[PDB]
Design a protein around this nucleic acid. Structure first.
Lengths: 53, 49, 49, 104, 147, 121, 125, 49, 186
RNA sequence: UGUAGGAGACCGAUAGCAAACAAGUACCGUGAGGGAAAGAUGAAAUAGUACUCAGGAAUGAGCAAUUAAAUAGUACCUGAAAUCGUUAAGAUGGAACGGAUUAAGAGAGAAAACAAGUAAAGAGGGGAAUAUUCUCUUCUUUAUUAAAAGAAACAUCAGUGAUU
RNA sequence: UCUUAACCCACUCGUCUUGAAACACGGACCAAGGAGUCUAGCAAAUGUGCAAGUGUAUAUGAUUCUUUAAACAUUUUACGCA
RNA sequence: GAAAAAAUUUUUUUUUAGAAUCUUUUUAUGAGUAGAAAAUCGUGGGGUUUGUGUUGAAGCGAAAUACGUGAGUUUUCGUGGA
């Protein structure tokens, strides 16, 4: 540490490089979820699949 | 840009006009210029100036 | 070694995004700008088409 | 409202297809737009400034006199057209025509 | 990014801005925060004083939602009310506005600022400051303790 | 274009071009049909067969008509009777012609060809 | 030494070829500025290969001018004639490296119509 | 401020429409460039060794 | 050889010209530079310089603060080389004449509602090129949170700069040198 | 990870997987193991060097010969530098090169580094008048008057010296 | 332009070192390859958009479906930070 | 907003600037390792613009009355064939 710099709070001392994950599937995953529920509803005659709480 | 009259009229609705609840962008307000009129040379030309 | 850790994307902000679209549409409006952009405007018969 | 010829120069003084600048010695920056009178890059040269701009060009094997909406025409004929719609400048357009007219 | 970097300014320059005499090597006082109090005491004292030691009792599971505190000052209390509605209250001497601060998201009303003189208002809240209470009484308003 | 089932890469198309099964080899050994024949059969192009009569439209050998001798599927080259060439030692062989460069006049009729024509029309 | 031609004065003819380039064969003759200590260039000992210096820079009226008395403009398309006619009295055409002979000949003819010589006119003939 | 609408045959000219208020917005060319570049970064694929 | 202090050079500091590529602001500073050089008065020159300045030297001015100043100048035109912000601690307006660099829409609407006047700098230039009977205003410089950390070293006697603290936590940065009980105190 | 798709602001054969290939191979290690180098003629070889002569043969040459092309012949695309060969020119009394400044040689060049217009007869091109009459133009060609431009030289000034 | 000449001047470059022409260290030669980067968090700077708010998070939605792996939208007290 | 020359007052020849990180003008200044800044020039790819291609480009060797203080840029001949 030097000059006006705040003390750090990082935890990258453990071997994080094989414990890290980056999401590149997001929008396609969202599309897949939409497709899955749409297919399910349609299969059920188009009848509601929704749950009343 | 080549517009349909349909498109041109819809555009006007979208960014505020008629206040259409689903077509309008939710409580959106268009930006305004810092300079009211960019003809600076007309300001220079003016009698007061 | 290159890794997928790389900050490829960016958050582009909603108000900024809207402003860019609106301002680009306004710019598209301007006849002088259309020609400057390289569109062959000579035989066109209105400022927005 | 939000626009002027002055603002257009601010937008376009580096940015325009018709702007060409010499690499081979850095003295020489041209603006070649259809309504541009003298093909140096200045707004007073530029076809994007004057309200009903007037220019002698050549295109498609033919000397064309153009006026800004946007009208186009092909010595007596030239002389007559310049006197008619037109508003230093006349003298330059005559000089330009003399040079253009010989060309094949 | 790459084309504007300091390395692009210094590309053929040996040590290249990091000291030819120095001959640049990593963390040469030791790692991270570690030289604090020992070797970097002067930096830590001058820039982060109250860092070292043990102060106070402990509260083993804090549970911050239990003691949650969304405040407003009296100054901004009127600001929760629209302009035209406020004009109607200003006009009509016979009535006062009720303001449910909790329904607008707040629990405590504090005493910074001014309430306009001779102008009753009803303030509903869980908590009020002594000063806030005094101002509400002073202006002829009412305070409502409410859950 | 629109289908995402098949690659738009140069790479896959080339590999497919080189590793072709026989029906594919036959497809890319098709030639364009003569104009009245196209009207007759309702068919733009046909797979070449042994006793076909082609006209050459490209290369130094253009404008020559003639019967097909042998077809070379492997090098994708047809041989025609009057496109001879002598070699370094003076042996005469036929010049191999890619099927892009020929237009088909009289196709050979046979049972398989009849089935193809019936399928097409 | 100094090379006057009319009111076009150019200060230095000889290019500032790089320090001891023949001495170490790996070195190329184009200038490279020593970051070396005791280099006999920056440490400014007389009698070595001279450093280039901004002081040698051209006069503002000349700046990029040729003994031709016209600024060179490089030409790869016919269409480049249209600004060059108005500037012909101050600018000269040079035809680009690529230019196909049929097009090149046509440009040469055009240059004559514009009344401006091509400085590399004999090329590709 | 009215702009003329044309038919699909450009010989013929139909009902004139008022220009939208979107086209009156400021032209922020630097904003448009910076947003475009930021957007382009979002469209670029990741890479690693 | 001539002996020279600072090698004979005037090497004064600050902005050369507007660094932004924003067309409207570049156009606006050209106008105000033109006015500044021709006009006798200081006013235009000061406005031109202030228009050029950095973002942190473009603070917002409070509507309440402008209102508080203008009540001694009751018919006069305020010009503000920054943005004007609205106030939700403010009960009502007293009707104002304001030229500003930027208006928040709620403030502008409030000014219009009040029957006041919203002036752009081009409109001001047209109406008042001299600046006679006009009033130059500017917002707080040292209000900003970076400046709240500037000045004398944390824990050094009489200091009152905010530290660049590690985190919000109770146990942190209240001990050594910040209370007499632990080591010492500032 | 296995298999199948689809990709790219990725690499372009010293890179990219160790592997664009008959490479997890050759090869090395007692063994566990360690582990390479290694792509491209041409459109077409169903164009891959026929023939002749001199040679023991290899090879070589050809009046002979494929190809658009063979200092393109399968150790085949392009073919840099280092390196070494041939011819010519120069230099050469214990270095070698350099800087600054001239010189003599050896090369190169006409684009500013001379000659507008005028007349004659060849080659082209255009515009107007109501497809072809009128008319405007640029290059070659014969010779025929200008001129300008720089370098010299002296004089004349103005600035700056030195001299008596 | 190249080429020798000739007068005058001209010490191995890099390098660490207060100090190298050195009896200091590295360099036979040539070609290709060959070294301040990327992520996280933070800071100041400057630009930009908005302002007592701000960001739209996960996600939902669509007459969104080669390029679309983005773009667009979000039926008034969610959360971060202020 | 008209200056000159050539002809035979009128014909012919040249020129005729307004682009703010801009143009005109003036004066002062010009050392430099470690170091900081700015202006440049080049390489790979991307979008964009408007071009160059087998009446041989790139590439490569040798050059150029070439241009740039400079890195470099531009170009000629030879090879070369996408």
């Amino acid at each position: 540490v030097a000059h006006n710099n705040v003390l750090p709070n990082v935890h990258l001392h453990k071997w994080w490089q094989h414990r890290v994950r980056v999401n590149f599937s997001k929008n396609i995953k969202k599309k897949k979820r939409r497709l899955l529920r749409e297919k399910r509803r349609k299969a059920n005659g188009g009848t509601p699949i929704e749950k009343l709480h | 840009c080549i517009w349909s009259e349909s498109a041109f009229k819809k555009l006007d609705v979208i960014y505020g006009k008629i206040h259409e609840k689903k077509v309008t962008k939710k409580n959106y307000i268009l930006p305004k210029s810092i300079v009211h009129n960019p003809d600076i040379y007309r300001i220079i030309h003016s009698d007061k100036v | 070694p290159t890794k997928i850790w790389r900050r490829w994307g960016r958050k582009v902000n909603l108000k900024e995004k809207r402003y860019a679209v609106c301002s680009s549409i306004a710019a598209s409006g301007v006849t002088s700008l259309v020609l400057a952009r390289g569109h062959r405007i000579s035989h066109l018969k209105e400022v927005p088409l | 409202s939000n626009v002027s010829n002055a603002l257009v120069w601010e937008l376009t003084r580096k940015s325009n297809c018709f702007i060409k600048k010499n690499k081979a010695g850095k003295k020489g920056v041209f603006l070649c737009d259809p309504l541009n009178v003298n093909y140096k890059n200045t707004p007073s040269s530029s076809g994007l400034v004057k309200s009903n701009s007037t220019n002698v060009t050549l295109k498609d094997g033919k000397v064309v006199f153009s006026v800004k909406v946007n009208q186009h025409f092909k010595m007596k004929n030239v002389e007559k057209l310049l006197q008619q719609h037109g508003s230093k400048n006349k003298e330059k357009l005559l000089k330009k025509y003399k040079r253009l007219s010989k060309l094949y | 990014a790459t084309r504007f970097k300091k390395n692009r300014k210094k590309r053929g320059h040996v040590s290249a801005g990091h000291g030819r005499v120095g001959k640049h090597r990593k963390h040469p006082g030791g790692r991270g925060k570690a030289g604090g109090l020992h070797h970097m005491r002067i930096n830590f004292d001058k820039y982060h004083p109250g860092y070292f030691g043990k102060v106070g009792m402990r509260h083993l599971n804090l549970l911050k939602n239990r003691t949650y505190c969304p405040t407003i000052n009296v100054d901004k209390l009127w600001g929760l009310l629209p302009e035209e509605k406020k004009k109607e209250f200003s006009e009509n001497k016979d009535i006062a506005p009720v303001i449910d601060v909790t329904r607008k998201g707040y629990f405590k009303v504090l005493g910074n600022g001014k309430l306009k003189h001779n102008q009753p208002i009803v303030v509903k809240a869980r908590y009020f400051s002594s000063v806030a209470e005094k101002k509400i009484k002073a202006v002829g308003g009412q305070c409502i303790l409410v859950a | 274009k629109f289908n995402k089932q098949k690659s738009s890469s140069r790479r896959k198309m080339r590999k497919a071009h080189f590793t072709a099964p026989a029906g594919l080899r036959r497809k890319i050994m098709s030639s364009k049909l003569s104009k009245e024949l196209r009207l007759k059969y309702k068919t733009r192009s046909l797979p070449v067969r042994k006793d076909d009569e082609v006209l050459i439209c490209r290369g130094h050998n253009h404008g020559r008509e003639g019967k097909v001798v042998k077809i070379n599927r492997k090098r994708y080259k047809i041989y025609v009777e009057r496109v001879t060439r002598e070699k370094v030692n003076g042996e005469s062989t036929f010049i191999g012609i890619h099927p892009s460069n020929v237009v088909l006049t009289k196709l050979k009729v046979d049972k398989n060809r009849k089935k193809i024509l019936d399928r097409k029309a | 030494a100094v090379k006057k031609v009319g009111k076009i004065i150019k200060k230095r003819t000889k290019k500032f070829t790089r320090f001891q380039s023949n001495r170490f064969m790996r070195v190329k003759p184009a200038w490279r500025k020593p970051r070396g200590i005791d280099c006999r260039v920056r440490r400014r000992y007389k009698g070595t290969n001279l450093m280039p210096s901004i002081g040698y820079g051209s006069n503002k009226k000349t700046k990029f001018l040729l003994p031709n008395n016209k600024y060179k403009y490089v030409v790869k398309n016919v269409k480049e004639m249209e600004p060059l006619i108005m500037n012909h009295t101050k600018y000269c055409v040079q035809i680009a490296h690529n230019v196909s002979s049929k097009k090149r000949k046509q440009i040469i003819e055009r240059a004559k119509q514009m009344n401006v010589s091509v400085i590399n006119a004999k090329a590709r003939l | 401020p009215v702009a003329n609408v044309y038919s699909t045959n450009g010989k013929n000219v139909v009902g004139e429409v008022e220009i939208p208020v979107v086209f009156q917005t400021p032209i922020r060319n630097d904003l448009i460039q910076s947003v475009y570049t930021n957007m382009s970064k979002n469209r670029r694929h990741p890479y690693a060794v | 050889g001539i002996a020279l202090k600072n090698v004979g050079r005037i090497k004064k500091h600050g902005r050369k010209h507007l660094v932004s590529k924003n067309p409207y602001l570049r156009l606006l500073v050209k106008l105000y530079n033109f006015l500044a050089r021709r006009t006798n008065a200081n006013f235009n020159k000061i406005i031109a310089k202030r228009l050029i300045m950095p973002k942190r030297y473009r603070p917002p001015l409070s509507l309440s603060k402008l209102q508080y100043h203008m009540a001694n100048h009751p018919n006069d035109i305020a010009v503000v080389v920054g943005s004007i912000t609205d106030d939700k601690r403010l009960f009502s307006l007293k009707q104002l004449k304001v030229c500003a660099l930027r208006f928040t829409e709620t403030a502008r609407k409030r000014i219009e509602d009040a029957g006041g006047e919203c002036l752009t700098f081009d409109q001001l230039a047209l109406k008042y090129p001299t600046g006679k009977k006009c009033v130059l205003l500017r917002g707080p410089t040292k209000a900003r949170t970076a400046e709240k950390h500037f000045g004398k070293a944390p824990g050094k006697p009489k200091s009152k700069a905010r530290p660049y603290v590690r985190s919000k936590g109770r146990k942190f940065e209240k001990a050594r040198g910040r209370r007499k009980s632990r080591a010492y105190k500032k």
